[PDB]
């Protein structure tokens, strides 16, 4: 398992514009297009992202290209964020994947606000971190995914993702 396989499980793959868990237009492997309620606005963002007139549909190669860009953006966002970088650097490789997953789902600013959980993670107080992370809108709105990511932080193993 690696971060691509992990987020592919959590986000799925859809080649036509769809609405994500929050009702926002999205495509591919969790690529958010816009928070606007306008499908036309989403289609315009899609064409801009892919570089051709897509009419709301992309290929698997295009979805995977957006995904590579998005994972890279999540990692770069962590490394540029003064609250997130030290915690990330303190983590082992498996737990770094859990961190990237959270930033991919909710964005860098959003995770950087998880102040108390970040401190527990930096301190390697894993069970305490797990309890704190679950006290969140994130957990209540996407509990199955949050449980997987939390188990990954708690254990430092891929047990929650084996086998898919």
UniProtKB/Swiss-Prot annotation:
GO cellular component: host cell cytoplasm
Induction and repression of expression: Expressed late in the viral replication.
Annotated coiled-coil segments of the chain: none
One MF term in the entry's GO annotations: lysozyme activity
Mutagenesis or variant effect for residue 117 to I: 500-fold decrease in enzymatic activity
EC number: 3.2.1.17
InterPro entries: Endolysin_T4_type, Glyco_hydro_24, Lysozyme-like_dom_sf, Lysozyme_dom_sf, Phage_lysozyme-like, T4-type_lysozyme
Active site: 11, 20
pH dependence: Optimum pH is 7.3.
Gene Ontology annotations of biological process type: cell wall macromolecule catabolic process; defense response to bacterium; peptidoglycan catabolic process; viral release from host cell by cytolysis
Reactions performed catalytically: Hydrolysis of (1->4)-beta-linkages between N-acetylmuramic acid and N-acetyl-D-glucosamine residues in a peptidoglycan and between N-acetyl-D-glucosamine residues in chitodextrins
EC primary class: hydrolase
Keywords annotated in UniProt: Antimicrobial, Bacteriolytic enzyme, Cytolysis, Glycosidase, Host cell lysis by virus, Host cytoplasm, Hydrolase, Viral release from host cell
Family annotation (PANTHER family): T4-TYPE LYSOZYME 1-RELATED
Family from the record: Belongs to the glycosyl hydrolase 24 family.
Its job: Endolysin with lysozyme activity that degrades host peptidoglycans and participates with the holin and spanin proteins in the sequential events which lead to the programmed host cell lysis releasing the mature viral particles. Once the holin has permeabilized the host cell membrane, the endolysin can reach the periplasm and break down the peptidoglycan layer.
Protein name: Endolysin
Organism for this UniProt entry: Enterobacteria phage T4
Classification of source organism: Viruses, Duplodnaviria, Heunggongvirae, Uroviricota, Caudoviricetes
Gene name of the record: E
């Amino acid at each position: 398992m690696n971060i691509f396989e992990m987020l592919r499980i959590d986000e799925g793959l859809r080649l036509k514009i769809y609405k994500d868990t929050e009702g926002y237009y999205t495509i591919g492997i969790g690529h958010l297009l816009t928070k606007s309620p306008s499908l036309n606005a989403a289609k315009s963002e899609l064409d801009k992202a892919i570089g051709r007139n897509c009419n709301g549909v992309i290929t698997k190669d295009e979805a995977e290209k957006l995904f590579n860009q998005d994972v890279d953006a999540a990692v770069r966002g962590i490394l540029r964020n003064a609250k997130l970088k030290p915690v990330y650097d303190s983590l082992d490789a498996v737990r770094r994947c859990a961190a990237i997953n959270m930033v991919f789902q909710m964005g860098e600013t959003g995770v950087a606000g998880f102040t108390n959980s970040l401190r527990m993670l930096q301190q390697k107080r894993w069970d305490e971190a797990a309890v704190n992370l679950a006290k969140s809108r994130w957990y209540n709105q996407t509990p199955n995914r949050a449980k997987r990511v939390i188990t990954t932080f708690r254990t430092g193993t891929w047990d929650a993702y084996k086998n898919l």
